[PDB]
């Protein structure tokens, strides 16, 4: 594997790590979700272009579409949470325990 593939995979790992390690703002985590989607898009596009798989050229576009549905979903939830607390802090989501 060339250095570009490892750079893309490292980008995905950094974003996943960013998602997993929460700070305070919910939106900061939605941004890491978007970054994971972007890294997947670039990785799959590079693999598809390199092997000249013509039909697969439509799959990153599809991959983009469901990226928006996931973002629009998340932002929707971020609205409701904010409407309850006046803040998007994940500390407030502690009504339910394990």
């Amino acid at each position: 594997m060339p250095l570009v593939y490892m750079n893309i995979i490292m980008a995905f790992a950094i974003a996943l790590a960013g998602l997993l390690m929460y700070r305070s703002h919910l939106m900061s985590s939605l941004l890491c979700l978007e970054g994971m989607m972007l890294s997947l898009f670039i990785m799959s596009t590079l693999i598809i272009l390199n092997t000249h798989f013509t039909l697969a050229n439509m799959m990153p576009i599809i991959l983009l579409v469901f990226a928006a549905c996931e973002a629009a979903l998340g932002l929707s939830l971020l609205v409701m949470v904010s409407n309850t607390y006046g803040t998007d802090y994940v500390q407030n989501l502690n009504l339910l325990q394990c």
Binding site: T84, Y85, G86, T87, L95, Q97
Partner: protein
């Protein structure tokens, strides 16, 4: 001469948030009767702006 059935002091053992109360967990409270918490009347501030003189 009567079979023993549970009373209030027995029933109250299961009324807690958790079956085994713990120093830290004794401050947990049971959920509301409907799953509706009191509305958190958060003060969403209105922006204050000076329109004029200049």
């Amino acid at each position: 001469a009567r079979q023993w059935q549970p009373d209030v002091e027995w029933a109250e053992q299961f009324g807690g948030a958790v079956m085994y109360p713990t120093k830290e967990t004794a401050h947990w409270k049971p959920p509301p009767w409907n799953d509706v918490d009191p509305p958190k009347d958060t003060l969403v501030s209105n922006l204050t702006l000076n329109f004029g003189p200049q």
